[PDB]
Amino acid sequence: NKLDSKHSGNYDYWYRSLRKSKLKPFERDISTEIYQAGNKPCKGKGPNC
Amino acid sequence: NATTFASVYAWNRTRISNCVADYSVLYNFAPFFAFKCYGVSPTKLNDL
Numbered sequence: 001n002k003l004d005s006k007h008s009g010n011y012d013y014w015y016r017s018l019r020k021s022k023l024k025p026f027e028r029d030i031s032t033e034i035y036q037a038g039n040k041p042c043k044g045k046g047p048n049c
Numbered sequence: 050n051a052t053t054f055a056s057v058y059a060w061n062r063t064r065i066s067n068c069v070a071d072y073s074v075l076y077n078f079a080p081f082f083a084f085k086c087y088g089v090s091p092t093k094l095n096d097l
């Protein structure tokens with residue numbers, strides 16, 4: 001807390017929450033591709049994306 | 050799809066039980082901008 005806390009908020013660090021499948025152990029995912037919900041294609045921020 | 054929504058200080062509370070929750074309709078809504086889930090996977094709601 002006394003090394004990685006900013007009064008305005010620390011947005012430099014992130015986590016991944018949306019992906020098609022869970023990660024196998026010791027696997028690294030770095031892509032920032034958008035997530036698709038259902039079968040509707042995704043091209044940007046919006047419904048199901 | 051309620052026509053009238055309650056105020057923030059008087060937020061309406063509703064209880065839903067003994068039924069099947071269909072989250073596909075929830076995902077189908079277009080004007081949805083902010084959707085955050087904590088403690089559970091949003092894509093696993095249809096299973097849990």
Ligand SMILES: *[C@@H]1O[C@H](CO)[C@@H](O)[C@H](O)[C@H]1NC(C)=O
Pocket residue numbers: 024026027028
């Ligand atoms: C390795 O890359 C392939 C092809 O993109 C992908 O399907 C697979 O999940 C990746 N495996 C790991 C362990 O990152």
Ligand SMILES: *[C@@H]1O[C@H](CO)[C@@H](O)[C@H](O)[C@H]1NC(C)=O
Pocket residue numbers: 051053061062063
């Ligand atoms: C508001 O909550 C009441 C019970 O407190 C319920 O009967 C009513 O249907 C709710 N209305 C809406 C629009 O959710």
